[PDB]
Protein backbone atom coordinates (compact mmCIF):
# COMPACT_ATOMS: atom_id res chain seq x y z
CA UNK A 1 0.00 0.00 0.00
CA UNK A 2 2.84 2.31 1.02
CA UNK A 3 5.27 1.32 -1.77
CA UNK A 4 4.32 3.59 -4.69
CA UNK A 5 2.37 6.21 -2.65
CA UNK A 6 4.30 6.46 0.65
CA UNK A 7 3.01 8.56 3.54
CA UNK A 8 6.62 9.65 4.07
CA UNK A 9 6.75 11.54 0.79
CA UNK A 10 3.43 13.31 1.34
CA UNK A 11 4.53 14.30 4.86
CA UNK A 12 7.74 15.71 3.35
CA UNK A 13 5.76 17.88 0.93
CA UNK A 14 3.53 19.16 3.76
CA UNK A 15 6.45 20.01 6.04
CA UNK A 16 8.31 21.68 3.16
CA UNK A 17 5.64 24.39 2.78
CA UNK A 18 5.02 25.02 6.47
CA UNK A 19 5.37 28.71 7.41
CA UNK A 20 8.28 29.78 9.61
CA UNK A 21 7.78 30.51 13.26
CA UNK A 22 9.39 33.85 12.92
CA UNK A 23 6.70 35.15 10.66
CA UNK A 24 4.09 34.59 13.24
CA UNK A 25 6.42 36.38 15.61
CA UNK A 26 7.20 39.35 13.41
CA UNK A 27 3.55 39.74 12.45
CA UNK A 28 1.85 39.47 15.80
CA UNK A 29 4.30 40.47 18.59
CA UNK A 30 -4.85 47.08 5.39
CA UNK A 31 -8.30 45.55 5.93
CA UNK A 32 -8.59 41.86 6.92
CA UNK A 33 -10.18 40.84 3.60
CA UNK A 34 -7.32 42.34 1.58
CA UNK A 35 -4.83 40.76 3.95
CA UNK A 36 -6.46 37.32 3.53
CA UNK A 37 -6.59 37.64 -0.24
CA UNK A 38 -2.91 38.68 -0.34
CA UNK A 39 -1.95 35.68 1.71
CA UNK A 40 -4.02 33.36 -0.51
CA UNK A 41 -2.25 34.60 -3.56
CA UNK A 42 1.09 33.80 -2.05
CA UNK A 43 0.20 30.32 -1.09
CA UNK A 44 -0.99 29.68 -4.66
CA UNK A 45 2.62 29.78 -5.90
CA UNK A 46 3.46 27.46 -2.98
CA UNK A 47 0.58 25.07 -3.73
CA UNK A 48 2.15 24.28 -7.04
CA UNK A 49 5.47 23.33 -5.53
CA UNK A 50 3.57 21.20 -3.12
CA UNK A 51 1.79 19.43 -5.98
CA UNK A 52 5.02 18.61 -7.85
CA UNK A 53 6.21 16.95 -4.67
CA UNK A 54 3.24 14.60 -4.49
CA UNK A 55 4.09 11.14 -5.86
CA UNK A 56 3.05 10.78 -9.53
CA UNK A 57 1.38 14.18 -9.96
CA UNK A 58 4.21 15.12 -12.35
CA UNK A 59 3.22 12.16 -14.49
CA UNK A 60 -0.21 13.33 -15.42
CA UNK A 61 -0.70 15.23 -18.64
CA UNK A 62 -0.04 18.95 -18.29
CA UNK A 63 -3.68 19.65 -19.05
CA UNK A 64 -4.66 17.44 -16.21
CA UNK A 65 -2.31 19.01 -13.69
CA UNK A 66 -3.85 22.35 -14.70
CA UNK A 67 -7.40 21.02 -14.30
CA UNK A 68 -6.55 19.38 -10.95
CA UNK A 69 -5.10 22.58 -9.43
CA UNK A 70 -7.82 24.93 -10.77
CA UNK A 71 -10.41 22.40 -9.56
CA UNK A 72 -8.98 22.10 -6.04
CA UNK A 73 -6.90 25.11 -5.01
CA UNK A 74 -9.47 26.63 -2.78
CA UNK A 75 -10.20 23.40 -0.94
CA UNK A 76 -6.48 22.68 -0.68
CA UNK A 77 -5.66 26.20 0.53
CA UNK A 78 -8.50 26.07 3.21
CA UNK A 79 -7.23 22.69 4.38
CA UNK A 80 -3.69 24.02 4.96
CA UNK A 81 -4.66 26.98 7.09
CA UNK A 82 -7.34 25.16 9.09
CA UNK A 83 -4.85 22.57 10.37
CA UNK A 84 -2.21 25.31 10.68
CA UNK A 85 -4.59 27.08 13.13
CA UNK A 86 -5.44 23.98 15.19
CA UNK A 87 -3.79 25.34 18.36
CA UNK A 88 -5.23 28.89 17.96
CA UNK A 89 -8.36 30.02 19.79
CA UNK A 90 -11.11 31.51 17.57
CA UNK A 91 -8.78 32.53 14.73
CA UNK A 92 -6.63 31.53 11.74
CA UNK A 93 -2.93 31.90 10.98
CA UNK A 94 -2.22 33.25 7.48
CA UNK A 95 0.67 32.19 5.28
CA UNK A 96 2.12 35.70 5.67
CA UNK A 97 2.36 34.96 9.34
CA UNK A 98 -0.50 37.25 10.28
CA UNK A 99 -3.21 36.17 12.68
CA UNK A 100 -6.88 36.98 11.84
CA UNK A 101 -9.20 36.79 14.80
CA UNK A 102 -12.86 36.05 14.08
CA UNK A 103 -13.79 39.47 15.54
CA UNK A 104 -11.82 41.06 12.72
CA UNK A 105 -13.74 38.86 10.26
CA UNK A 106 -17.03 39.79 11.81
CA UNK A 107 -16.03 43.46 11.65
CA UNK A 108 -15.28 43.16 8.03
CA UNK A 109 -18.58 41.39 7.43
CA UNK A 110 -17.30 37.91 6.56
CA UNK A 111 -17.76 36.22 9.92
CA UNK A 112 -20.37 33.62 9.04
CA UNK A 113 -18.20 31.54 6.69
CA UNK A 114 -15.16 32.27 8.87
CA UNK A 115 -17.06 30.68 11.74
CA UNK A 116 -17.93 27.72 9.48
CA UNK A 117 -14.22 27.15 9.00
CA UNK A 118 -13.59 27.30 12.75
CA UNK A 119 -16.55 25.04 13.63
CA UNK A 120 -16.53 22.41 10.90
CA UNK A 121 -12.82 22.17 10.09
CA UNK A 122 -10.43 23.65 12.68
CA UNK A 123 -12.33 22.55 15.80
CA UNK A 124 -12.75 19.02 14.59
CA UNK A 125 -9.17 18.81 13.48
CA UNK A 126 -8.48 19.66 17.17
CA UNK A 127 -10.86 17.28 18.83
CA UNK A 128 -9.20 14.53 16.89
CA UNK A 129 -5.61 15.66 17.03
CA UNK A 130 -5.26 15.18 13.25
CA UNK A 131 -1.53 15.01 12.45
CA UNK A 132 0.30 16.39 9.42
CA UNK A 133 0.60 13.00 7.72
CA UNK A 134 -3.19 12.64 7.86
CA UNK A 135 -3.56 16.28 6.71
CA UNK A 136 -1.21 15.63 3.79
CA UNK A 137 -3.09 12.48 2.87
CA UNK A 138 -6.51 14.22 2.95
CA UNK A 139 -4.96 17.02 0.84
CA UNK A 140 -3.51 14.48 -1.67
CA UNK A 141 -7.05 13.09 -2.10
CA UNK A 142 -8.47 16.56 -2.82
CA UNK A 143 -5.75 17.09 -5.41
CA UNK A 144 -6.45 13.69 -6.99
CA UNK A 145 -10.14 14.42 -7.66
CA UNK A 146 -11.29 12.30 -10.65
CA UNK A 147 -14.61 14.19 -10.90
CA UNK A 148 -12.85 17.39 -12.08
CA UNK A 149 -14.52 18.56 -15.30
CA UNK A 150 -12.26 18.22 -18.35
CA UNK A 151 -9.79 15.58 -17.11
CA UNK A 152 -8.31 13.59 -19.99
CA UNK A 153 -7.87 10.40 -17.91
CA UNK A 154 -10.12 10.37 -14.91
CA UNK A 155 -9.39 6.65 -14.36
CA UNK A 156 -5.68 7.32 -13.70
CA UNK A 157 -6.54 10.05 -11.16
CA UNK A 158 -8.99 7.75 -9.38
CA UNK A 159 -6.15 5.22 -9.28
CA UNK A 160 -3.87 7.80 -7.68
CA UNK A 161 -6.60 8.70 -5.24
CA UNK A 162 -7.15 5.03 -4.34
CA UNK A 163 -3.47 4.77 -3.68
CA UNK A 164 -3.46 7.58 -1.16
CA UNK A 165 -6.41 6.35 0.84
CA UNK A 166 -5.06 2.81 0.94
CA UNK A 167 -1.86 4.25 2.46
CA UNK A 168 -3.82 6.63 4.72
CA UNK A 169 -5.96 3.77 6.03
CA UNK A 170 -2.84 1.66 6.66
CA UNK A 171 -1.15 4.49 8.60
CA UNK A 172 -4.20 5.14 10.79
CA UNK A 173 -4.72 1.71 12.21
CA UNK A 174 -0.97 1.36 12.60
CA UNK A 175 -0.58 4.57 14.63
CA UNK A 176 -4.11 4.69 16.13
CA UNK A 177 -5.12 1.03 16.43
CA UNK A 178 -7.35 1.75 19.44
CA UNK A 179 -9.48 4.17 17.35
CA UNK A 180 -11.15 2.02 14.65
CA UNK A 181 -13.50 4.71 13.42
CA UNK A 182 -10.66 7.17 12.85
CA UNK A 183 -10.21 6.52 9.10
CA UNK A 184 -13.94 7.04 8.38
CA UNK A 185 -14.35 10.28 10.30
CA UNK A 186 -11.21 11.66 8.60
CA UNK A 187 -12.94 11.12 5.25
CA UNK A 188 -16.22 12.60 6.49
CA UNK A 189 -14.70 16.07 6.80
CA UNK A 190 -14.43 16.30 3.00
CA UNK A 191 -18.16 17.09 2.34
CA UNK A 192 -17.77 19.97 4.82
CA UNK A 193 -14.62 21.14 3.01
CA UNK A 194 -16.57 20.94 -0.27
CA UNK A 195 -19.33 23.31 0.87
CA UNK A 196 -16.93 25.81 2.43
CA UNK A 197 -14.80 26.00 -0.70
CA UNK A 198 -17.95 26.72 -2.69
CA UNK A 199 -19.04 29.40 -0.27
CA UNK A 200 -15.57 30.88 -0.24
CA UNK A 201 -15.55 31.16 -4.04
CA UNK A 202 -18.91 32.96 -3.86
CA UNK A 203 -17.24 35.59 -1.69
CA UNK A 204 -14.24 35.95 -3.98
CA UNK A 205 -16.46 36.28 -7.05
CA UNK A 206 -18.32 39.03 -5.20
CA UNK A 207 -15.10 40.84 -4.25
CA UNK A 208 -13.79 40.71 -7.77
CA UNK A 209 -16.87 41.81 -9.66
CA UNK A 210 -18.66 44.23 -7.37
CA UNK A 211 -16.10 44.80 -4.68
CA UNK A 212 -13.06 46.95 -4.27
CA UNK A 213 -10.71 44.33 -2.76
CA UNK A 214 -7.49 44.43 -4.82
CA UNK A 215 -6.66 40.99 -6.21
CA UNK A 216 -3.12 39.92 -7.07
CA UNK A 217 -2.50 38.37 -10.41
CA UNK A 218 -2.35 34.62 -9.73
CA UNK A 219 -5.44 34.59 -7.52
CA UNK A 220 -7.17 36.72 -10.15
CA UNK A 221 -6.14 34.09 -12.80
CA UNK A 222 -7.74 31.39 -10.63
CA UNK A 223 -10.99 33.24 -10.66
CA UNK A 224 -11.11 33.47 -14.47
Amino acid sequence: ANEDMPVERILEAELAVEPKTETYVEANMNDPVTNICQAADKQLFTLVEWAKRIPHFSELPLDDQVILLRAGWNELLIASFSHRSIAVKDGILLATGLHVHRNSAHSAGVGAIFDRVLTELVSKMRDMQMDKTELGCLRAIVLFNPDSKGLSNPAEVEALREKVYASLEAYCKHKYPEQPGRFAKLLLRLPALRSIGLKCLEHLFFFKLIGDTPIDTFLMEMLE
Partner: peptide, 20 residues
Protein backbone atom coordinates in the same frame (compact mmCIF):
# COMPACT_ATOMS: atom_id res chain seq x y z
CA UNK B 1 -5.57 30.92 -21.01
CA UNK B 2 -4.08 30.24 -17.57
CA UNK B 3 -0.59 31.51 -18.31
CA UNK B 4 0.55 31.66 -14.65
CA UNK B 5 -0.32 28.04 -13.83
CA UNK B 6 1.17 26.73 -17.12
CA UNK B 7 4.49 28.54 -16.62
CA UNK B 8 4.77 27.35 -13.01
CA UNK B 9 4.05 23.74 -14.00
CA UNK B 10 7.15 23.33 -16.10
CA UNK B 11 10.35 21.75 -14.82
CA UNK B 12 13.55 19.97 -15.85
CA UNK B 13 13.17 16.56 -14.33
CA UNK B 14 9.95 15.72 -16.18
CA UNK B 15 8.80 16.01 -19.83
CA UNK B 16 5.68 18.07 -20.85
CA UNK B 17 3.49 14.99 -21.20
CA UNK B 18 5.28 11.86 -22.07
CA UNK B 19 4.89 9.23 -19.38
CA UNK B 20 5.28 5.49 -18.84
Amino acid sequence: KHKILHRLLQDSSSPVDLAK
